[PDB]
Amino acid sequence: RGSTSEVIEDEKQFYSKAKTYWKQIPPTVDGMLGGYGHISSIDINSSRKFLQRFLREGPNKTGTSCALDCGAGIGRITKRLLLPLFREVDMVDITEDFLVQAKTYLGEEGKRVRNYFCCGLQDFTPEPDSYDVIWIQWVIGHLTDQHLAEFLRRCKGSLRPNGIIVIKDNMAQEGVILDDVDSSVCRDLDVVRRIICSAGLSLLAEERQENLPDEIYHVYSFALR
Amino acid sequence: VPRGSTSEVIEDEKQFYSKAKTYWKQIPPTVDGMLGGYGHISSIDINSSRKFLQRFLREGPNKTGTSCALDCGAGIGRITKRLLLPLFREVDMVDITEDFLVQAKTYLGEEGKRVRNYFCCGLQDFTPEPDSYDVIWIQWVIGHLTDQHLAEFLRRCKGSLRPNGIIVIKDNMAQEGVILDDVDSSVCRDLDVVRRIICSAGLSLLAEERQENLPDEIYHVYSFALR
Ligand SMILES: Nc1ncnc2c1ncn2[C@@H]1O[C@H](CSCC[C@H](N)C(=O)O)[C@@H](O)[C@H]1O
Ligand SMILES: Nc1ncnc2c1ncn2[C@@H]1O[C@H](CSCC[C@H](N)C(=O)O)[C@@H](O)[C@H]1O
Helix, strand or coil, rough: CCCCHHCCCCCCHHHHHHHHHHHHCCCHHHHCCCCCCHEEEHHHHHHHHHHHHHHHHHCCCCCCEEEEEEEECCCCCHHHHHCCCCCEEEEEEECCHHHHHHHHHHHHHHHHHEEEECCCHHHHHCCCEEEEEEEEEEHHCCCCCHHHHHHHHHHHHEEEEEEEEEEEEEEEEEEEEEEEECEEHHHHHHHHHHHHHCCCCCCEEEEECCCCCCCEEEEEEEEEE | CCCCCCHHCCHHHHHHHHHHHHHHHCCCCCCCCCCCCCHHHHHHHHHHHHHHHHHHHCCCCCCCCCCCEEEEEECCHHHHHHHCCCCCEEEEECCCCHHHHHHHHHHCCHHHHHHHEEEEEHHHHHHCCCCCCCEEEEEECHHHCHHHHHHHHHHHHHHHEEEEEEEEEEEEEEEEEEEEEEECEEEEEEHHHHHHHHCCCCCCEEEEEEEECCCCCCEEEEEEEEE
């Protein structure tokens, strides 16, 4: 199958089952990463190198005043990637108890989290002209093709000048594959690039994550604006 | 050959129980502690348990009630919080580790106000009140009882069931025999042994189901619904 419309039988249930699944996940790094908490550092260190080139290389350098963490969970990325690099961070996640745990997990530096938004991305509108970086990691599989394109268009309008959107997520070898366990899909590169294009975004950089276990989906980062 | 009963693998019953009590006393009161480092599989487990259980809550001549459940070996209340409290008006918990029951008060949150009794007792010494529970949930703790104590506990659970009540066992199953884990001081039994014990307790199987989507390296997990 080549689209979510071909693999999702019931859209209302696709979303309701996903919300149920994460409501039942322990609010921990290993819970966020499906038992691969031990590779969080490998992930974060690679993301930081990917991101830092946009924050330090001009002309038209990306700014560091505010970032948005989408599907942020308990704040694994907010804690170790975003808060050290941005003066303020907003978080949005559908699971309220993860945002509650984030207040504890993030500690003293979490005081610089400006907004905690409890909302599904498909229902979320980031404020216009607000974010230098919008980070979307391991959650795009929870939106339909159409809702993903529409959300990315809203994100584009929330970027400050020189801002970027970063997508980091699992990529399927071919087609669009439904995971009936957590109620998410995985898409191949051509599908994702097509959705990015439909949202009016340009691809600035693309990089495959190295040093991951051989058994898991390949992971790619895309920088967009 | 393969061993067929705990009386072939347990050298000293008093020490089998005392070692287990000491082991759990030093486990963190967290979902990852409850699940032996596999905390991330909790939602897979809860979704399967709910689908398994809801079959028996359907309207009909044998419909299981929703007034009260008992969570056996409940730990901090992972199952009470995610599975049982949403479906039953009240829930009782029983566990040998006091500080898990203390932590439960925090872990369960506002809905924890509907937890009625917190029993701090080994299952082998616990006698639930007759005619009190619609569902008795026994998950990942049967390996901590001897064959004789498990059969007897199931007999006492049978007496505590309301009309149309059920007992659910969900636990690790060995491919063959009875295998001792001398770290946490528990056994893992094969399906034939477990079925033998269930039958000796005067219980019968309504349903039996293997748990899907688990990591390949761990013991297989089965659910049994009993009355
Ligand atoms: N429709 C949706 N909208 C917003 N968040 C969603 C969502 N569906 C699932 N989620 C959230 O997406 C997260 C996936 S786990 C990944 C967590 C985080 N991005 C990290 O890398 O550490 C969970 O926190 C879950 O609550
Ligand atoms: N003899 C015994 N009687 C009652 N509880 C016991 C016991 N031996 C061990 N336990 C308890 O059994 C639990 C095993 S961990 C499983 C916890 C819970 N059933 C869940 O699935 O989330 C621990 O909480 C431990 O304290």
